[PDB]
Design a protein around this ligand. Sequence first.
Ligand SMILES: [Ca+2]
Length: 124
Amino acid sequence: ALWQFRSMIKCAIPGSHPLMDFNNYGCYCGLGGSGTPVDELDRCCETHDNCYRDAKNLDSCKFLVDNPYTESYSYSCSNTEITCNSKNNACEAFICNCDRNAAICFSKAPYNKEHKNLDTKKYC
Ligand SMILES: [Ca+2]
């Protein structure tokens, strides 16, 4: 889940907005655009998209029409670090693993907060 990993993405960035620091960014990070990224940090948004979807195809969730931003969450928060859920059928918990390893790219990665604010021309 996207709003539900976006409580804890503001624990992840002590920080401010969970996305919008990402929505626009290098190309598209988390929300906005489409194509390929720029940063190591923007790569976990090519896959918070490419491992985010696949609930739609899932071994554990056979149904078509999940929507790429929706399924999981039952979390936490510490210093800046959470957990994900406390139940696990892949329907939620597979999507929850894509969300938290993106909270880890997004809190930390080989980050650069530098190509914010952008466009997709120079950028994508
Ligand atoms: Ca995107």
